[PDB]
Design a binder for this molecule. Structure first.
Ligand SMILES: NC(=O)c1ccc[n+]([C@@H]2O[C@H](COP(=O)([O-])OP(=O)(O)OC[C@H]3O[C@@H](n4cnc5c(N)ncnc54)[C@H](O)[C@@H]3O)[C@@H](O)[C@H]2O)c1
Ligand SMILES: NC(=O)c1ccc[n+]([C@@H]2O[C@H](COP(=O)([O-])OP(=O)(O)OC[C@H]3O[C@@H](n4cnc5c(N)ncnc54)[C@H](O)[C@@H]3O)[C@@H](O)[C@H]2O)c1
Ligand SMILES: CC(=O)N[C@H]1[C@@H](OP(=O)(O)OP(=O)(O)OC[C@H]2O[C@@H](n3ccc(=O)[nH]c3=O)[C@H](O)[C@@H]2O)O[C@H](CO)[C@H](O)[C@@H]1O
Ligand SMILES: CC(=O)N[C@H]1[C@@H](OP(=O)(O)OP(=O)(O)OC[C@H]2O[C@@H](n3ccc(=O)[nH]c3=O)[C@H](O)[C@@H]2O)O[C@H](CO)[C@H](O)[C@@H]1O
Ligand SMILES: [Cl-]
Ligand SMILES: [Cl-]
Ligand SMILES: [Cl-]
Lengths: 340, 339
């Protein structure tokens, strides 16, 4: 058995009480479903800024009534410290996902992104420290590599942030390290690489590339590739991220106070991604006969991203089970049902 | 000297300035210098750590004609509407409003983060929208963190060691990001242990020089946190004043830069105690007690010395005050202030 299988059996036999912030969002709601499916007690915190009530309802429909009875939901804002303290009380493990993604969003409104991602994160870090939680895993970002060119991306070699959003996610790591130094508070940051899967919002001005193209192709609208299309990414199926969160939360002190890449260590260009979506969608009775529209590059885009996940494998036992193709096969049916 | 050229140019061609934290230590010294150059100045301060008596002292030092060119706004940089009001019609911004004291940030990281990152970002956006000609902001030598190399060069830094150091580093990160994304240039000044008149001695978080000076004037005990070999590059406030004005009037080939502002010198804590006792003795103030050596203070860097070559080449920074000359000029303020 891999470490994830052992961890799931240990949690089921020895339940912890968890907190998932951003539980009404994409990654948060996937963590919530998995944890409740392991018979855990879970507290949730979300203000519905970008998450949806219907994500919570889907989790409710998927878990048993016994498991849903162990879920306490708090509609609240992490910018409000009283909300964070209320959410973390009596909690053993914190999985912090609440934030405002979308580098483009941060460029339009840097102030709001700073308030939520830095101010809100700091409120959660202080609340967890005071409540003496056993683990604090927070969502970091692959944007922390910035303009550093080296590929694959290794955790100890980073570059200059290139957007206000990248600043906030880098600062989460800086405050987490400082809290370890000054107060002895341990934490794990997970630098996600382009996570995708069910319940990633396809609507909105700031939708990710996979959900955005999927909705357009289902609707037969134009799909635009920003650049020449060879821009590559390490798309990470959400189930891989779920595995990383639970392993990080249950890790020993060697695996704590660390930052880990969370990806598949693979390369997929934007042209290849379009082809993958076209074939997977064809398996769901979805025709898309139009070609991609190649347009100008998007300001601030790194051209190539691939992650070295050796650190997560060695220290956490991280063995992702889904490549991009298997994740797309599982995720595409969610979008056909949701967008029908 | 570049600084003399700058002051003459300002006198003939007055600009409108904004100084946030104008009621504080460095801010009030900048205010006195700018008004002494016949500049129009806007001020923004919430009196969180500054004092009205610093503003009144500035008024007593400048002519009534110069003081008439000063508009003061009691306001908070955490309130974006206040920043927008403050930067209106302004050509040069000298942003000093913040919460210093590494010790304060360890006790209350949230408030320090709110002012130093959130407040700084409010000022940076407001200045960007108002299209100011210059934006010079106070950075800190704490950004070097645990980096061992001495002297400190701008391109070599280490990991922050306190919540306060995080906030000052984030100021540089946002300034660099704003240059990339919006084309807004700015200058960060990494101060090294600035001292001089109107640095508050009456505080739980008072800097070492004002605290030891007040204790020695009053005949109280003086405590050294550690072995006394801890060294610093103490920078007289007038050197920092010169750096702000040179940075504010620099061309773009001197903007979007971060500069060390210090003297390139070493002074241990025991030597500093010797200097304070000697300077006060020159003003008829006796202090015959020995220093009390205690444990180290959490998270304090042991040695800090700055390479100021970058500021000299790009800004013409020629600091005029070493530590001893600055102490001689500043001590009379403290004897007068306490009495
Ligand atoms: N591919 C990715 O989506 C990706 C990549 C890198 C990092 N991340 C990080 O992972 C985390 C989750 O991202 P996601 O893709 O699930 O985004 P999402 O928008 O789907 O979910 C974020 C959730 O946080 C909530 N939230 C936002 N501000 C809040 C506030 N002030 N108080 C309380 N709740 C608040 C939203 O309502 C939403 O439910 C974020 O921290 C994000 O930066 C995601
Ligand atoms: N040795 C030093 O003095 C030193 C060293 C490195 C950096 N700095 C930086 O220099 C700047 C000035 O520091 P100082 O030594 O004069 O400290 P100070 O406390 O004397 O001055 C700061 C001023 O800012 C004001 N202020 C604080 N929060 C505010 C807010 N939210 N809105 C408006 N005004 C606010 C205070 O009232 C005060 O007048 C700070 O940014 C500090 O970090 C100082
Ligand atoms: C640094 C980072 O992780 N930023 C966010 C973003 O990462 P990214 O900006 O890496 O994700 P994205 O899907 O916005 O962009 C990925 C790639 O697809 C390209 N592209 C996108 C849209 C489109 O219509 N056509 C096209 O070609 C885009 O230019 C880039 O090359 O993705 C998610 C949704 O934004 C999350 O919010 C992430 O936190
Ligand atoms: C300069 C720097 O890198 N960081 C910040 C910090 O400087 P510092 O923390 O260096 O300022 P400070 O003068 O309080 O500390 C300098 C040294 O003096 C020691 N000490 C202090 C007090 C005392 O009673 N006895 C004693 O021995 C202290 O332990 C340290 O070793 O504080 C400043 C506020 O003034 C600013 O916020 C600076 O940005
Ligand atoms: Cl709020
Ligand atoms: Cl105070
Ligand atoms: Cl903030």
């Amino acid at each position: 058995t891999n470490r994830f299988e052992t961890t799931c059996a240990q949690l089921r036999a020895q339940p912890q009480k968890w907190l998932v912030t951003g539980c009404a969002g994409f990654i948060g709601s996937n963590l919530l479903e998995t944890l409740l499916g392991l018979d855990q007690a879970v507290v949730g915190l979300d203000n519905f800024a970008t998450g949806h009530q219907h994500n919570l309802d889907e989790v409710r429909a998927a878990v048993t009534p016994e498991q849903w009875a162990r879920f306490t939901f708090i509609e609240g804002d992490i910018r409000d410290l009283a909300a964070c303290q209320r959410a973390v009380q009596g909690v053993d493990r914190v999985l912090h996902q609440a934030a405002l993604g979308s580098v483009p969003r941060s460029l339009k409104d840097p102030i709001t992104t700073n308030e939520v991602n830095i101010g809100g994160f700091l409120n959660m870090l202080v609340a967890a420290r005071d409540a003496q939680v056993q683990a604090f895993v927070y969502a970091a970002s692959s944007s922390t590599y910035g303009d550093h060119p080296d590929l694959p991306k290794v955790e100890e070699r980073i570059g200059n942030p290139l957007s206000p959003y990248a600043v906030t996610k880098y600062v989460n790591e800086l405050y987490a390290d400082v809290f370890a130094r000054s107060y002895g508070f341990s934490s794990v940051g997970l630098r996600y690489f382009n996570v995708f899967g069910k319940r990633q919002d396809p609507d909105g001005a700031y939708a990710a590339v996979i959900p955005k193209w999927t909705a357009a192709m289902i609707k037969g609208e134009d799909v635009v590739i920003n650049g020449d299309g060879q821009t590559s990414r390490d798309f990470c199926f959400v189930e891989n991220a779920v595995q990383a969160n639970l392993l990080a939360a249950m890790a020993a002190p060697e695996g704590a106070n660390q930052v880990y890449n969370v990806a598949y260590n693979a390369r997929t260009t934007l042209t290849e991604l379009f082809e993958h979506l076209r074939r997977t969608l064809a398996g769901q009775g979805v025709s898309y006969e139009k070609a991609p529209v190649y347009a100008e590059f998007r300001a601030g885009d790194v051209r190539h991203s691939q992650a070295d996940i050796g650190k997560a494998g060695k220290l956490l036992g991280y063995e992702p089970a889904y490549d991009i193709l298997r994740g797309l096969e599982a995720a595409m049916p969610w979008y056909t049902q949701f967008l029908r």
